[model samples]
Target: KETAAAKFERQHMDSSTSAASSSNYCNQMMKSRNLTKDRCKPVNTFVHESLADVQAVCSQKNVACKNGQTNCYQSYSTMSITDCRETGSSKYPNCAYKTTQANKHIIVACEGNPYVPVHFDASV
Candidate 1:
């Protein structure tokens, strides 16, 4: 079984490309990352920053998560990211998504023995 921390990376981290260059970013990425393995994810965000940099967020500015957990932290710096949201025409097997790129502060929840980000709470 995959840990939440590692699962977070698999589902969210994408440093392969520097930025969203093509209109098919979501289609290709969502497929390559196996997001469509079971069913299409309604929405997801990919952070281009390095894993170490993201993991460091566990020790960044402490803040309350969306669920009111005190273990979350918001990044001190805004980073490049791409948000993939299912389009109205989206469906299983042929899931469709719209890509929206931006530079924003990330908020993630940390947990486990390593005390690393396990869940991406939001982007601010």
Candidate 2:
């Protein structure tokens, strides 16, 4: 049997164009393990390009944020996983993975200062 790590690496980390596969792999793993129905743990990643696109989105919305401000827009993007490990507790172990899920190509626009994220366009 292939280990979960091996599966994650094969489907996510090794491919140049396999983000969907990575997500599917993780989803399948969760289902097979009966972790939770439609409640797969996510791998968080931040990209420099996404930050720039966020700034651009803010610009489009005429939003200005001060320096050293922390701003975030919520959106689900495809992930390219590099590593994963079981966490949480013994009775209910949780899978935690690392990936670059931030889709810099997509941009979410907001309407307020620091761009309070109104919505996202799949393509930016």
Candidate 3:
């Protein structure tokens, strides 16, 4: 029941949050998003932008994806984002993250007839 696009939203989209969220943002969100349930996800990104804005990225500029699928696109402008990476001492059920906040032109791989983002590649 896991649609690629839906999974992308669950893992990457967090429109309601901002850099205003405390340093614990990653620790909290990563868990709530189930990235830290059984094991810690080494890294993940949370984008703070409207859903529509993110959707528009799919229609921006098409580029090469990680695997050369040519289904990736980049954002026209920089946006707020936070990366959650597991720390050295991270452990299951106590997954810790070293959060890094930045503004970047996010790159994503999209799919489907209308073209919706299905995977987050990187930020630039």
Candidate 4:
């Protein structure tokens, strides 16, 4: 049987392709930050059902989640926030104000491929 980390690395690293994919970042950011190759800061990963899912889970836990608020978008190479007020939108106006309070690295997880729990870890 393969350990979780082993399986994770296998699925994400073994396959070779020139194009970028979501799982590719699982280790890339950490390595880059450790080497000081760039001024890259690792944001905490939050897995949710959907953008709205983050709000729902946070609300149920009684954690104050900024509703209709936007934060930085991590889907690409640059750092930017959205302006929309929806709980889980990638709009800018909403992102501008969130820079101070919350720097969220949101990742939406769907059922399939790798079965895992909603967990957070500090990236290097």
lDDT of candidate 1 over 12-124, digit per residue (tens) = 99987777887789998999888998899999999989898899999999999989889999999997899999998898979999999999999999998889889999999
Model 1 steric clash pairs: none
Maximum-lDDT candidate: 1
Q: Give the range of the ten consecutive residues with the poorest summed lDDT in model 4.
A: 77-86
User: Each model's C-alpha lDDT?
Assistant: 0.91, 0.36, 0.89, 0.27
Model 2 CA lDDT for position 48: 29
TM-score of each predicted structure versus truth: 0.95, 0.27, 0.95, 0.22
Top TM-score model: 1
lDDT of 3 by residue, 1-124 (tens): 9998899999999999766377788998898898876778999999999888998999998878878888899999999999999999888868899888999999999889778989999999
Model 4, residue 75: C-alpha shift (Å): 23
The 10-residue segment of model 2 with minimum total lDDT is: 43-52
Residue-level lDDT for 93 in candidate 3: 67
lDDT of 3: 0.89
The candidate with the higher TM-score, 3 or 4, is 3
| Stronger candidate by lDDT (2 vs 3) | 3
Model 2 lDDT at residue 123 = 36
Q: What are the root-mean-square deviations of the candidates from the true structure over C-alphas?
A: 0.9, 13.0, 1.1, 15.9
Name the regions of candidate 2 deviating beyond 4 angstroms: 1-45, 49-53, 61-92, 98-104, 114-124
